[PDB]
Each structure stands twice: as structure tokens, then as C-alpha cells.
Curated annotation (Swiss-Prot):
A GO molecular-function descriptor: tRNA binding
Annotated EC: 6.1.1.26
Annotated GO biological process: tRNA aminoacylation for protein translation
Subcellular location: Cytoplasm
Record key words, sorted: Aminoacyl-tRNA synthetase, ATP-binding, Cytoplasm, Ligase, Nucleotide-binding, Protein biosynthesis
Name of the protein in question: Pyrrolysine--tRNA ligase
An annotated GO cellular component: cytoplasm
Covered range of the whole protein: 188 to 454 of 454
The species this protein was found in: Methanosarcina mazei (strain ATCC BAA-159 / DSM 3647 / Goe1 / Go1 / JCM 11833 / OCM 88)
Keyword ATP-binding: yes
Top enzyme class: ligase
Taxonomic lineage of the native organism: Archaea, Methanobacteriati, Methanobacteriota, Stenosarchaea group, Methanomicrobia
Gene: pylS
Family: Belongs to the class-II aminoacyl-tRNA synthetase family.
Task performed by this protein: Catalyzes the attachment of pyrrolysine to tRNA(Pyl). Pyrrolysine is a lysine derivative encoded by the termination codon UAG.
Length: 263
């Protein structure tokens, strides 16, 4: 008897990218399932015996090291932010991203992006720190949203403001970063300040990057050249570990380092 679609779905939960097992050599479902359960249990046992690190935590630590070592100040800013910051980001009450915001009270929301707090840090730090100002943050962001989007995700955003804010410098930082992580990519932009660049892995967007200045800056009291980019950590993990589904890379009770916890 052929496997049912439901049975196949169940085995796929238990399958890890490089399992050499074949789902069509006569073995009944129960046997295939039992084999995969054994393997996934042994995977968790191995993590628990040796490293004990969560991939999302560990990636955050590796990225933090990378940016700190290259002169960028580590920021930890609020996750719960004023709703006014979203409007000030140019996201109107009729925009599609406006419908994706998780509101919390009359006045607050879960940040859907790192830009507003980083804008405020850039303005504030310009009074204390020498040119150029280099900062980054990694942490949770939220958007009401498939196989590439999560409602709860983790962004890296880095910024430089003042001298050296060129397209070439931005591309070089992106290039050093992803070659450090071991992640294949191409940078796409219309090749003729103002530019947005997409960092792609095949069809998957890893990042949107901006060469400022842009008109939005004045809303935030910023009037200097700047460059920056945001990367989703769950996307980076998905690519690095070859997960078929991004939910395997997320904060989750169903997956641990891309291993099913329903065993
Ligand atoms: C001060 C200052 C200025 O600083 C800056 O603003 N500097 C320039 C950075 C601007 C770009 C960026 N920061 C941005 O605005 O969000 P995005 O919608 O473009 O998506 C960014 C990335 O987040 C991930 N991502 C987004 N949505 C999701 C999701 N639902 N699930 C998983 N991953 C996601 C994914 O990797 C995507 O490519
Ligand atoms: Mg984008």
C-alpha cells in the first residue's frame, strides 16, 4: 500500500535535510516512522550531550561578535514601541503594512522593524560619538503575515552614519558578513544615494539594504549620509541548515534546532 498524504506529512515532520532514507522501498509507515523517531531522538540526545546551544541564540551570538569586532555598537532597544513611530515611519492607516501591525494598547505596538529605534539612537549618539556612527541591533520583530514568512521573527539591522556611507561599503559589509556565515547570495539593485538593494538567495530575500540619505530621515532629525541593512535570522538559518520550511528555524515549541519536538 502507498503512503497516504497524511502519512507522508507526518514523516516529513520527522525528516531532516540529509536523511538518506527512501519513502518507497516497501516498508510500512509504522516502520518508517519508528526509524525517523529513533533518529530524531538520537539527534536531540547528541545536542544535549555535547553543545546544548539553540541555533537562533547561537546565530545571534555569532552575528553580534562579527559586528562588534568590525566597530559597531550593540543596541538593545524596546520591542514594545509607540504606535506613533509607525506613522512616523511613513506607514499610513490605509497601507498594507499597517494591517500587519500587532497593536498592544491605545498607544503601543510590537515593533515590525528595527528602523525607528535605530533612527533615534543615531540622532542621540551623534552628540557623543565620533564620526562615523556605527550601530546594530538583533532582536524580535512582529508582523501579521507562508513557507518564507513568520509572524514572530528575529531581525539583524546594522547602520553606519556620517563618513564612508557608500554603496560599495554597504556591499562589502554584506559580502564579508555572508561569506563569514557561509551563505551564498547575490546583490540585486537598479545599477544607476537613495538605492534599495535586495540580497537574494535564489528566490529567497535575505535582506533589504538602503544607501541613504532618503527623505524620511528628516522626520527623525537625521541629516547625514547613512547606509544600512536588515536580515531575518530565521531566513539565514533556513538557508544554512537547508530547512524546507522556515518554521523549523523559528522560536517554537514544535521544533528545536529544526528537530521535531513531537516524538
Ligand atoms: C535607523 C534606520 C534605518 O535602518 C534601515 O532601515 N536600514 C535599511 C534596512 C531596511 C530593511 C529592513 N530593515 C526592513 O525595514 O524590513 P523588510 O521588510 O525590508 O525585510 C527585511 C528582512 O527581514 C526579514 N523578514 C521580514 N519580514 C519577515 C517575516 N515576516 N518573517 C521572517 N523574516 C522576515 C527578511 O530577511 C527580510 O529580507
Ligand atoms: Mg523587503
Amino acid at each position: 500500500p502507498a503512503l497516504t498524504k497524511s502519512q507522508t506529512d507526518r514523516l516529513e515532520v520527522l525528516l531532516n535535510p540529509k536523511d538518506e532514507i527512501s519513502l518507497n522501498s516497501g516498508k510500512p509507515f509504522r516502520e518508517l516512522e519508528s526509524e525517523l523517531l529513533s533518529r530524531r531522538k538520537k539527534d536531540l540526545q547528541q545536542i544535549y550531550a555535547e553543545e546544548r546551544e539553540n541555533y537562533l541564540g547561537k546565530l545571534e551570538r555569532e552575528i553580534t561578535r562579527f559586528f562588534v569586532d568590525r566597530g559597531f555598537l550593540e543596541i538593545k532597544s524596546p520591542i514594545l514601541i509607540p504606535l506613533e513611530y509607525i506613522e512616523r515611519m511613513g506607514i499610513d492607516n490605509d497601507t498594507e503594512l499597517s494591517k500587519q501591525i500587532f497593536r498592544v494598547d491605545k498607544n503601543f505596538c510590537l515593533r515590525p522593524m528595527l528602523a525607528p529605534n535605530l533612527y533615534n539612537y543615531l540622532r542621540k549618539l551623534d552628540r557623543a560619538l565620533p564620526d562615523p556612527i556605527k550601530i546594530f541591533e538583533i532582536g524580535p520583530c512582529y508582523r501579521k503575515e507562508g513557507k518564507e514568512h513568520l509572524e514572530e521573527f528575529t531581525m539583524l539591522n546594522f547602520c553606519q552614519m556620517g563618513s564612508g556611507c557608500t554603496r560599495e561599503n554597504l556591499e562589502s559589509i554584506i559580502t564579508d558578513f555572508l561569506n563569514h556565515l557561509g551563505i551564498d547570495f547575490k546583490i540585486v539593485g537598479d545599477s544607476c544615494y537613495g538605492d534599495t538593494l535586495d540580497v537574494m538567495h535564489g528566490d529567497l530575500e535575505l535582506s533589504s539594504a538602503v544607501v541613504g540619505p532618503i527623505p524620511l530621515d528628516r522626520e527623525w532629525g537625521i541629516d547625514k549620509p547613512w547606509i544600512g541593512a536588515g536580515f531575518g535570522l530565521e531566513r539565514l538559518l533556513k538557508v544554512k541548515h537547508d530547512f524546507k520550511n522556515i518554521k523549523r528555524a523559528a522560536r517554537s515549541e514544535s521544533y528545536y534546532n529544526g528537530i521535531s519536538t513531537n516524538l
